[PDB]
Amino acid sequence: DPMVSKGEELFTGVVPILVELDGDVNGHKFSVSGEGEGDATYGKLTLKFICTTGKLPVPWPTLVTTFLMCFARYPDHMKQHDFFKSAMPEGYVQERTIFFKDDGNYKTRAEVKFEGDTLVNRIELKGIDFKEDGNILGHKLEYNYNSHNVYIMADKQKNGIKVNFKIRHNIEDGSVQLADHYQQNTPIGDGPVLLPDNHYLSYQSALSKDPNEKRDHMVLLEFVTAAGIT
């Protein structure tokens, strides 16, 4: 399929990634830069994020979803359903509202696309209605991450996809903080895209710390595999 081909030829080896985030939560301003690389053949991504403005005023785990579904490993039988790659290199826009149970919400807008050989994810995040002393602004979330399936469906009338899922963040007291994600993606370009049958992406994520890094930061290792269409 010369369309499955165009995507193949962009994602076949290791692709460098850049992430840039501009955030304001309850008027707490911040910026984060990330660098790393993805190897979609293995569903694999390795990234290191740095808050370049000083202290991050929310917990790192709350940003993981916001900080590259084009790097999903789609099984051969499923390549006809990979919207993310089909949109490249012109890219797509990924928008979310993330509702933190009994706390505030994030609204995010990203553009994911190639800049030359580099895959770039440029994001704006606004958070509102947070409790200054809650789990988020009060930093009560553990530095870890659970595995999760993400259900993708077509959004045909918008020529894109809708994704809906819940993240449970572990709190220090042993309870969990739910973060209900609502997501919409639309291609940036005017050309055709693969619009998928209902399927899901399986995520595992590992958070760690660079021992030689003094700035506030997060090292993220993710594996992402499509499934759900036998």
Keywords for this entry:
230 residues, mainly beta, Green Fluorescent Protein, eleven-stranded mixed barrel, 2 helices, 11 strands, 50% strand, Green fluorescent protein, GFP-related, Green_fluorescent_prot, chromophore
The gross shape turns out to be globular
* Number of distinct beta strands: 11
Beta-strand share of residues: over 45%
Read across the widest sheet, the strand sequence of neighbours is 1-2-3-11-10-7-8-9-4-5-6
The CATH class assignment is Mainly Beta
* Helix amount: under 10%
The ordered string of helix (H) and strand (E) elements is HEEEHEEEEEEEE
Query: Would you give the CATH topology?
Result: Green Fluorescent Protein
Number of helices: 2
CATH superfamily: Green fluorescent protein
Task: Label the structural class.
Answer: mainly beta
- Compute the separation of the termini in Å: 20 Å
Q: What is the total domain count?
A: 1
Radius of gyration over all CA atoms, rounded? 17 Å
Q: Describe the biggest sheet?
A: 11 strands, mixed, barrel
CATH architecture: Beta Barrel
Family: Belongs to the GFP family.
Organism: Aequorea victoria (Water jellyfish)
Function: Energy-transfer acceptor. Its role is to transduce the blue chemiluminescence of the protein aequorin into green fluorescent light by energy transfer. Fluoresces in vivo upon receiving energy from the Ca(2+)-activated photoprotein aequorin.
Keywords: Chromophore, Luminescence, Photoprotein
